[PDB]
Amino acid sequence: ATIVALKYPGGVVMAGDRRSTQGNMISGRDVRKVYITDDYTATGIAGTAAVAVEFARLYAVELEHYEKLEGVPLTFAGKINRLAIMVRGNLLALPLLAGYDIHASDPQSAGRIVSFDAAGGWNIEEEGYQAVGSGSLFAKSSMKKLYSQVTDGDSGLRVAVEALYDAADDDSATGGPDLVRGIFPTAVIIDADGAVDVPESRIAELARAIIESRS
Amino acid sequence: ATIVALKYPGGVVMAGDRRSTQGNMISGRDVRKVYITDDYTATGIAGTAAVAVEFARLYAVELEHYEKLEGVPLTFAGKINRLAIMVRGNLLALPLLAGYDIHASDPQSAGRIVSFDAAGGWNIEEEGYQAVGSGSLFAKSSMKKLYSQVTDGDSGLRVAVEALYDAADDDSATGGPDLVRGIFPTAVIIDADGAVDVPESRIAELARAIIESRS
Amino acid sequence: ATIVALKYPGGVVMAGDRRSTQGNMISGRDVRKVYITDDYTATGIAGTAAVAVEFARLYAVELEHYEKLEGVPLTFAGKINRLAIMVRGNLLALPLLAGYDIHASDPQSAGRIVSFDAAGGWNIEEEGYQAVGSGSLFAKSSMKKLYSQVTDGDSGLRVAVEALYDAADDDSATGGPDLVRGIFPTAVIIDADGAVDVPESRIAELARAIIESRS
Amino acid sequence: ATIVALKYPGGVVMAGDRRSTQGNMISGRDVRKVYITDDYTATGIAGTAAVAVEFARLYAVELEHYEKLEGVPLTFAGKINRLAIMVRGNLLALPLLAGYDIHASDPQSAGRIVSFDAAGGWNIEEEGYQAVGSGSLFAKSSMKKLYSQVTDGDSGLRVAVEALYDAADDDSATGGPDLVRGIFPTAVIIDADGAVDVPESRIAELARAIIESRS
Amino acid sequence: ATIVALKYPGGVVMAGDRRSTQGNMISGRDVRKVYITDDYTATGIAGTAAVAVEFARLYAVELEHYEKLEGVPLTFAGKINRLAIMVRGNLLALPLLAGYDIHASDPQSAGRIVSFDAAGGWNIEEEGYQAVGSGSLFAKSSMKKLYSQVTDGDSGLRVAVEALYDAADDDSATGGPDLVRGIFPTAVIIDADGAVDVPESRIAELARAIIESRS
Amino acid sequence: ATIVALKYPGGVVMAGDRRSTQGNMISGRDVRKVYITDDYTATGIAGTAAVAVEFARLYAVELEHYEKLEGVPLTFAGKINRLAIMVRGNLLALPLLAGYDIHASDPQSAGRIVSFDAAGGWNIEEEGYQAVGSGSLFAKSSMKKLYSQVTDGDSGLRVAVEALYDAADDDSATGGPDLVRGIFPTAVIIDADGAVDVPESRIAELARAIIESRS
Amino acid sequence: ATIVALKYPGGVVMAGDRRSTQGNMISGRDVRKVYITDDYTATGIAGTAAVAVEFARLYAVELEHYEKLEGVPLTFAGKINRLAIMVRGNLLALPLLAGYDIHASDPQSAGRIVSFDAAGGWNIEEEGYQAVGSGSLFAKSSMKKLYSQVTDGDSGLRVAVEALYDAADDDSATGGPDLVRGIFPTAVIIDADGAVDVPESRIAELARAIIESRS
Amino acid sequence: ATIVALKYPGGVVMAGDRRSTQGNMISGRDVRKVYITDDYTATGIAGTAAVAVEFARLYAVELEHYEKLEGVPLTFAGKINRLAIMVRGNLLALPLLAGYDIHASDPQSAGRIVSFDAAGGWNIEEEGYQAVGSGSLFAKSSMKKLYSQVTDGDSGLRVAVEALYDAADDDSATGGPDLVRGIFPTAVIIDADGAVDVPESRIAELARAIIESRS
Amino acid sequence: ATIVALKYPGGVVMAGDRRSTQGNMISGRDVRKVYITDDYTATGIAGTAAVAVEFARLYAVELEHYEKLEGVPLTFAGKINRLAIMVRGNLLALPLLAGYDIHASDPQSAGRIVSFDAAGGWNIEEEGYQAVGSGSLFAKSSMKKLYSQVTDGDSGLRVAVEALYDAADDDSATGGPDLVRGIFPTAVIIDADGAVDVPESRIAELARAIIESRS
């Protein structure tokens, strides 16, 4: 499994693969690993569907509990602090966080990426892209060369899909586009208007274009 | 990796995949695992290309040494005896042997399949098909249902390619047809006229037909 | 032991074998491993009769306690949540859940199958069939080829019995139809009218027909 | 696997099952475990076909080497001595030996059964029957009650087949009569005229009669 | 030690041996291992006299406590549930339970046998006989052949004594009839009129008849 | 197993039991553990029949080789020296040696008993009796009280049989007189005229008399 | 150390040795190991004086506490139950209990002997004698032959002293009569009139007579 | 350390870094890891200078010994066979081989790359580029995107230097261009005219251009 | 076991006990542990009779071999050198050596005692007495007080017997005078006329006198 997040002017994009395996045997085919936990925040865990969905549900419940109790949503700094408490208490796969900062001075530079290390410490990415999972190295090396082509949301989505394809090309634990069954990776786009899921047809067309170009 | 061999009236077919990995990382893309070691005998080892090619070279050298020394090729019973000595001396992956018995009373029932267990003991298959490797179980379960359709060499080749596809569908260590790079599994057909390699275009067309049917 | 569940238009079917062993010695001959725990829900545990019956009794008591306390039966989403709490608390063999969703928009697509992994996480099957136990791989590989013939309840029952037969054919820990003692596998069918046990004579006739066809 | 040998007036009978497994998975279906190594001697090893056939071949070669060198066949006492040397050198499964003593004073009491323990020591049976393998206990307990019915070769063969059936009934590693595939146990009868293999039709009829009686 | 229980029309019988040893040395000669814990229920533990008598005393105290508190004896289903709680709490040798169901629809089919596995799970026997202990296998194999002769209480008692004799014949940890000291196995018969101990003279005569027949 | 040897005026007697077991299961019923290896010497090994018979054969071959080479039998001191070399080379059960010294000054005090310890050192008994095996302690304690009644060969034989009975009474690994099958212990008597085997009828009558007296 | 207790008509006797050692070095010379804990009950522990005296003191305090609280002495069945609770709580050497049952129907058969195994379970002796300690086997084997001579208290005392002498003769950890220092074993006799200590002169005379007879 | 080799039309290029470390401490600054061992063959070992230089010297001595003995240089197939013998004998770091095949039918497709796995098996690269060492993954991922720009020797050299820079950017064990000390990576170019070392000024200019472009 | 040697004017005396045990059980009663290996030399090993007698035989054979080869007996210095070679080669119990030096300048000071440590090094005693074995400490402490009374051979013998008695009084592994069986310790006296064994009656009288004095 591999989850990739990269920043573009005016927002941030997130995507993940759809494969879960027990060693050398394929366990699932349409595993969803990216979820929307808030109006301006999405999370992703590289692992089984159950762990990721439980983590997303717990984070959403915590955020909504604070929101209902105090009547105001938490600041982005406070959102990261609560997430790290949950990660430390659990310990395991580590989560990836991407969101939008609506209180930032510059709207064009408001997208954020947060990563947690093995020890549970959180770091804020400054290179504009981050990948986690087994194929994280290949995806990051691909984004290193492909990040110069990102200028808007569509370019960022294309680059993320290409990074996922490159990661799946070199890792057997990551699944590539399934053009026989029709199962493509899921993506989430967060901007000033909020976090929205990308429709499967645009994902499908981008994957088909990348596959045709690679031939 | 998975190597499948099945018997058809008047001969026998053998095929193998083209993937080698170090755990979760793909190492090779066009690995050849089936070789022709005699005029009426082919062998296959599920593993790296180097081990398989060295084993095939050693077996061919031994057979040719006996042939040149005594002026007559060994009997099929004597060929199996020498192979088991080589397997026992080495110990590891285990080989698969398929050949044609030209001294058999019935030419239509002359194809043979030989398998070696972990302890090194050899067994002669009587069910008409055999598969070895990590995806051997899935391939054998597929041939269990698909063996009723085998009536000639082409039907056997189609069934073998379908078995390889089914094995690759459930195992991440076995590679399926590569329709982007153009790398398809290798096959060997042995009949009364001798062992011959199958051209890559017929392999390609059968793989394409199977993929289209599966969609 | 092997428990197989597959979906058909308008419902879902579940079946299991009748063998329990201590290693290489047969312990029981008429072990029941599928139980009805609710009007629209059945469960199955691959193991001894005592563990399965205790699990079914506990689940039924929990469901009935909530039903009597709140006056309304739990939703299907809430039923899975309570079951996962019980599985996590115990840890062991893992359960298989099949039920009918009466609140679904499409009645023809209301059957559900739920599986729990080793870590205790629950997953909802989307491929239409699922098998658990020691012979799960063979049963799943058989259903992979036989699922195209399922169009109603009787077809699904035939396919499930054939899958159980194929699983018992390759595994020594799973028992096949006993035509001398008269012990055949047990099956449960859940539809819009509720969960009902299948009579032993229809099971017997289907097993006899399959055995005759295999000869 | 289980090999049973019992004495009848004027000879001795030997039989074995046709199942080989790797733990809980069935490996073979028509494994032969009883072989004729001399004109008045047969042997049987509970295990894989390769080990048993190699042991029989080695024993036959040794016996024939002595026979050709000295011009006279070895005495029965000398045959056991050479066999124990081979067993000790190897060490593992242990062999079972049955033969006819043509130099005995009483022709009716000439059948012999020899067993080797774990330490490699040989013992001559005096209770008239002996069983080795995983299901040896059940077979011996069955022969304990069924030995009173043995009065000739046919009665002994029936009792041996019934003992094999009883052993397979309680052990999952021993295979019973296959009335679908048509694979029945192999038997060898040794008398004053020499050791002969029993035809498969008489085996089949006895198995069918026993199965019908058990119903 | 070995405890055997078998069902006959209108009741059930239970018997056990009278030997306790510390490895290869005999410790006791007249150990009693079967006790009456209720008007329609008896239990037996294969082990030392102290453990069995303490278990029987505890079970009787629990049953009588419930009987005095609620004024009505427990149902047979409730009696098994309380016994399993005691077995689980202790963990060891495992108990054997035999009793009469006075609320059953058919009086002739009211005898019950309950067995507990190593994990502590309880199972209800359906084959009509059950044996526990070190010589359980031999006793069960003997009852397999001798169960066709059971038609009343006396026939069942004879078959149970013969099973105990056969178990003691092959196991050194089980004691046979002592015709020098005069110590014979103890038996308990439960019918519609209640559980009663069998007098030692009928046990003695049956043992003497069996010994004479075996000579 | 237990082997007992005691001295009487003018000779020495030796006897052993007829039981061999693998732990708690009886392996043999008529095991012979005492053999005659010379005209004035017998040996006995507590263990399986194969080890004892091989040891006796080797000792006899060594003695006969020296006798044929030098033309004169070895002295009793030289016989013990060669036996200790064989015991040390092997290392295991330890042997017991009893013989007659024809060169002794006093014919009435010529019987000898030799015992080997765990370290392999040999000792000459001076208390007049010695027992080896698992039940050696009970047999020796019985002979301690019963040695005052030995005045000739028949008295010594009776005392030896009684010692064997007492040893079997307290040890489960030693077999007592079998009055159903008719298997009684074997005995050897060595005097000035040589070593002779005792007929089974005198053994049988002495065992029957002892059993009757014990009742 | 060895403690021996045997029953005679109308009572019971108990005796023990006077040696305590730390391995191969003698620690004490006049250790007392038998104590009177009640009017009709005595106990003995094979070990150091401190442990035995503390155990006797605790048992006496418990018995007297119940006697003073309820005004009536405990029944013999209740006395054993309290003792087993003390033994189980401690866990070690195991105690030996001998007493008189004044409520028994037959006064001549009122003596009782109770033994505790390693697991802490109590057993009531029925063979009339029991010995515990390191030399228990020799003492029991001696009493086996010497029990036929017991007809009154004096005969039982003589037999007990002889058993102690025989146990000390074969065990280095048990001390025999000291005719230089004047230290002889201690004995306790319990009858209908109560438990009384035997004077040292009668012990001394019996030991001297036994020693003279043995010479 | 990282060694990269890639093929261009009419030849092949090889390059390596100049860093050797003991864990986290830098050991060397100008380590040479690529050597010319023949007129048409160069080798490279990722490790210390001593091991690489000894390996190159041994390979050159072996090749020259065969050349002088037989008067003709070895074929490319024979050169690989001798190298694998040396690798197997040593076992450790694994070598990388690049050379020119002058007997190939197509001069433009004559460059060869050979890699040895951990087990010592040799493989011939078909993807046109190969990298070994600690930073091999990053270098290979960089060449994956940069291989489309290779059309001649200079383009291949630029791509190799860029791959080395990318590998050093992500790995702390690989050294990048030293613009203060003046130490740049070493490169070897093999073509139809033979293997030649690249001058340090062209390496320096390419490194400077890449660094300027990256800024 | 304990062996004591002490010097008196004009010679030296040596004595040892007659007990051999396996832990807490007595093995022998008349074990001899002191032997005469030369005309002026005796040795003693604390252990089993077999080891001591074999050591004495080997030493005597070596001494006699040198004596016959060279025609002159070895010097006392050369005798110790050969003994140490034998001790070192064996490695275990350690020997004690006592002898007479006939070439000494002072005949009254010619007795010698040699001791070997655990490492095998030999030392010559200068305190006039030495004891080895388990009870060596007690014997040495007794001789420390009793050495002032030694003035001739008889006084030394009395002191040695008293030391043995004191050693046996405190150690359970050493046997004291047996006044019932008549087994007393063995002693050897070496003087100018040679080494001679002490008759058993003088040993007996000295032991009786010591025992009477101790009372």
UniProtKB/Swiss-Prot annotation, chains A, B, C, D, E, F, G, H, I:
<dbReference type="GO" id="GO:0004298">
    <property type="term" value="F:threonine-type endopeptidase activity"/>
</dbReference>
<keyword id="KW-0645">Protease</keyword>
<keyword id="KW-0597">Phosphoprotein</keyword>
<dbReference type="GO" id="GO:0005886">
    <property type="term" value="C:plasma membrane"/>
</dbReference>
<feature type="active site" description="Nucleophile">
    <location>
        <position position="1"/>
    </location>
</feature>
<comment type="function">
    <text>Component of the proteasome core, a large protease complex with broad specificity involved in protein degradation. The M.tuberculosis proteasome is able to cleave oligopeptides not only after hydrophobic but also after basic, acidic and small neutral residues. In complex with the ATPase Mpa, degrades protein targets conjugated to a prokaryotic ubiquitin-like protein (Pup). Among the identified substrates of the M.tuberculosis proteasome are the pupylated FabD, PanB and Mpa proteins.</text>
</comment>
<dbReference type="GO" id="GO:0035375">
    <property type="term" value="F:zymogen binding"/>
</dbReference>
<dbReference type="GO" id="GO:0051603">
    <property type="term" value="P:proteolysis involved in protein catabolic process"/>
</dbReference>
<comment type="similarity">
    <text>Belongs to the peptidase T1B family.</text>
</comment>
<dbReference type="GO" id="GO:0019774">
    <property type="term" value="C:proteasome core complex, beta-subunit complex"/>
</dbReference>
<keyword id="KW-0963">Cytoplasm</keyword>
<dbReference type="GO" id="GO:0043161">
    <property type="term" value="P:proteasome-mediated ubiquitin-dependent protein catabolic process"/>
</dbReference>
<dbReference type="GO" id="GO:0005576">
    <property type="term" value="C:extracellular region"/>
</dbReference>
<keyword id="KW-0378">Hydrolase</keyword>
<dbReference type="GO" id="GO:0030682">
    <property type="term" value="P:symbiont-mediated perturbation of host defenses"/>
</dbReference>
<dbReference type="GO" id="GO:0010498">
    <property type="term" value="P:proteasomal protein catabolic process"/>
</dbReference>
<protein>
    <recommendedName>
        <fullName>Proteasome subunit beta</fullName>
        <ecNumber>3.4.25.1</ecNumber>
    </recommendedName>
</protein>
<dbReference type="GO" id="GO:0005737">
    <property type="term" value="C:cytoplasm"/>
</dbReference>
<comment type="pathway">
    <text>Protein degradation; proteasomal Pup-dependent pathway.</text>
</comment>
<keyword id="KW-0647">Proteasome</keyword>
<comment type="subunit">
    <text>The 20S proteasome core is composed of 14 alpha and 14 beta subunits that assemble into four stacked heptameric rings, resulting in a barrel-shaped structure. The two inner rings, each composed of seven catalytic beta subunits, are sandwiched by two outer rings, each composed of seven alpha subunits. The catalytic chamber with the active sites is on the inside of the barrel. Has a gated structure, the ends of the cylinder being occluded by the N-termini of the alpha-subunits. Is capped by the proteasome-associated ATPase, ARC (Mpa).</text>
</comment>
<feature type="site" description="Covalent link with the inhibitor MLN-273">
    <location>
        <position position="1"/>
    </location>
</feature>
<keyword id="KW-0888">Threonine protease</keyword>
<keyword id="KW-0865">Zymogen</keyword>
<dbReference type="GO" id="GO:0019941">
    <property type="term" value="P:modification-dependent protein catabolic process"/>
</dbReference>
<keyword id="KW-0068">Autocatalytic cleavage</keyword>
<keyword id="KW-0843">Virulence</keyword>
